[PDB]
Amino acid sequence: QWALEDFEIGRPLGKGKFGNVYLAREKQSKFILALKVLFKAQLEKAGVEHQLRREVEIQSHLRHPNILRLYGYFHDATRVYLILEYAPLGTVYRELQKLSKFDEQRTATYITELANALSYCHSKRVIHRDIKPENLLLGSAGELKIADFGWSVHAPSSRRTTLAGTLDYLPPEMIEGRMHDEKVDLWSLGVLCYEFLVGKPPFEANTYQETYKRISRVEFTFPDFVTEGARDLISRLLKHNPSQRPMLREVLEHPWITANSSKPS
Ligand SMILES: Nc1ncnc2c1ncn2[C@@H]1O[C@H](COP(=O)(O)OP(=O)(O)O)[C@@H](O)[C@H]1O
Ligand SMILES: OCc1ccc(Oc2ccccc2)nc1
Ligand SMILES: [Mg+2]
Ligand SMILES: [Mg+2]
C-alpha cells in the first residue's frame, strides 16, 4: 500500500538504537505524522526482526488515549518504516531535563495516566518491559502517551534477547534473567515515580556492574524533601519479590495519588 513517495519528510524528531524518527506529511491528505526509520542491515546484524513484528502487532491493535497509535508500515530493500501518531510536545525525558524535578501535582498526574494505560495493557496480558522517560511522549494537551513497544511480550516470559543499554528501570528478576510477568511494569512505575520527584533514578550508578548490584539488593534512599506519602507508594512498588508489589488499582487509589493527581481513573 504505502511507499516513501507518499510522504514529504521534515525535521528529525529523535534518534534511537535502531530508530531514526522524522516529522512527515502525507501528500494527498496533508496528514501530519511521525515516520520511524529502521535499517535492515542493522536489524539483521542484531537479530531483532522479531521485536519489530511484535511492535507492529501489539501497537496497531491497542486503542487507549494514553497509548501512542501505530497506523501502518512499509519497507524498501534497505529500510523499514513504521507510521506513528505524532506527539507534538515531545518526551517526558526532555521535560525532565528542562525542569530538573517535577512537583507532586505533575508527578502524580503522570503516574495516574501511566497506570491507566498499563492497566488496559495488562488486561490483554500484554507487558511493556521498557518503561522509561525516553519512551513516554506528550500529546497536544500535555497528556502522557506510552510508546516504543519493541520489547513488549505476552506473559509469562523469559528473556531471549541481550540487554543493550541501561539497567536503570529493570527489576531484579529480569536482570538476573529469571522468569517474569506483569509485575515488572509495576517496578518500572516505582523507579519512574522516584525519578520524577528526585531528578534521577534510585539505583543510578557509575558502572553497569555496580548498578546491577544496587538493583538486586534494592539499595535506595530518599532525599529529605520527599514526603511521607510518596515514600510509602515508592516503597510498596520497589519490592524484591514481585508478588508483594501492589495491583494497579491499589496504586490508582493510593491516598497520595488521589490527593495530588488532577486526572481520574
Ligand atoms: N511519535 C513520535 N513523536 C515525536 N517524537 C518521537 C515519536 N517517536 C519517537 N520520537 C522520538 O524519537 C526517539 C526514539 O523513538 P523510539 O520509538 O523510542 O526508538 P527506539 O525504538 O530506537 O528506542 C524517542 O525517544 C523520541 O525522542
Ligand atoms: O507482523 C507483520 C510484519 C510487520 C512488519 C514487518 O517488518 C519487517 C520487514 C522486514 C524485515 C523485518 C521486519 N514484518 C512483519
Ligand atoms: Mg525507545
Ligand atoms: Mg525499540
Ligand nearest to the CA of 17: 1
The C-alpha atoms of residue 194 and residue 191 are separated, in whole angstroms, by 5
What would the grid cell of residue 32 be?
501530519
Q: Which of 3, 2, 22, 4 lies closest to 14 in space, CA to CA? A: 22
Phi and psi at 220, nearest 5°, equal: -140, 160
Contacts of 61 (CB under 8 A, 6+ apart): none
Q: Which three cell numbers stand for residue 178?
A: 529469571
> C-alpha cell of 237?
512498588
Q: Is 84 in the pocket of ligand 1 (CB under 6 A)?
A: yes
The resolution in angstroms reads 2.2
Ligand closest to CA 81: 2
Q: From the CA atom positions of the chain, what is the Rg in Å?
A: 19
What ranges in 11-136 are assigned the alpha helix state H? 40-46, 49-61, 92-99, 104-122
The full set of domains in the chain, from first to last, is: 2-90 (3.30.200.20), 91-261 (1.10.510.10)
Print burial letters for 96-122: b (CB count within 10 Å at least 16), e (below 16): beeeeebebebbbbbbbbbbbbbbbbb
DSSP string, 184-222: HHHHHHHHHHHHHHHSS-TT--SSHHHHHHHHHHT----
15 assigned ligand-binding residue: no
Q: Which three cell numbers stand for residue 135?
A: 519512551
Give the total residue count for the chain: 265
Alpha-carbon gap, residue 258 to 253, rounded angstroms = 6
Which among 6, 76, 103, 130 is annotated as catalytic? 130
- Name which residue sits closest to atom 14 of ligand 2, judged by CA: 53
Q: Is any atom of ligand 1 closer than 6 Å to the C-beta of 184?
A: no
Helices (H) then strands (E): counts for the chain: 10, 9
108 annotated binding-site participant: no
State the closest ligand 1 atom to the C-alpha of 16, by its place in the atom list counted from 1: 22
Q: Ligand 1 within 6 A of 51 CB? A: no
Number of CB atoms found within 10 A of residue 69's CB = 16
Task: Give the position, in ligand 1's atom list, of the atom nearest the Cα of 134.
Answer: 25
Four-residue CA torsion sign, 129, 145, 57, 61:
positive
Q: Has 85 been labeled as part of a binding site?
A: yes
Which residue type, as a one-letter code, is found at position 76? D
Q: At what angle do helices 183-198 and 104-122 cross, to 10 degrees?
A: 170
Q: Report the distance separating Cα 224 and Cα 153, nearest Å.
A: 38
Q: Which atom of ligand 2 has the smallest separation from the CA of 57?
A: 1
Can you tell me the distance from the alpha carbon of 221 to that of 195, in angstroms, rounded to the nearest whole number? 12
Bridge partners of 146, per DSSP, are 67, 136
Minimal-distance CA residue to ligand 1 atom 13: 14
Residue 130 bears catalytic tag: yes
- Establish whether 73 is an annotated binding residue: no
Helix, strand and coil percent figures for the chain, each rounded to 5 = 40, 20, 40
Measure 52 CA to ligand 1 centroid, in angstroms.
14
Assess contact for 121 and 62: CB atoms under 8 A: yes
Question: Between vectors from CA 21 to CA 19 and to CA 23, what angle results, nearest 5°?
Answer: 165
Cβ–ligand 1 distance for 147 under 6 Å, the answer yes
Question: CB-based contacts of 159: which residues, under 8 Å, 6+ apart?
Answer: 174, 177, 180
CA distance 136 to 156: 24
DSSP state of 247: P
| C-alpha dihedral sign at 210, 212, 217, 223 | positive
